[PDB]
RNA sequence: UUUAAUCAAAGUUAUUAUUAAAUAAUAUUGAUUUUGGAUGAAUUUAAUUUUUAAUUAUAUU
């Protein structure tokens, strides 16, 4: 394995929302993002 | 008994029900019976990305 995985299929903003297609978060995202992205905005 | 043959359909019916849908801010380890069963790895889902987290303006770039 030169590179483990190049061009990961997440780079396309695949909408994997738990209420939309049934898949939860991708494993790379943390399961508990304490504060949403609005509170950091 | 004779019908020469034909020609019409208009306007009322029993005996029993309380379910759906939206709304309400006070629950929560998966809905459909008794694990493993050797006493052990079966029943493990974790990682800084608009995520069951959902954003009071018409300007500038």
Automatic annotation (TrEMBL):
Superkingdom as given in the UniProt entry: Eukaryota
- Name of protein: Uncharacterized protein
Question: Covered range within the whole protein?
Answer: 21 to 61 of 244
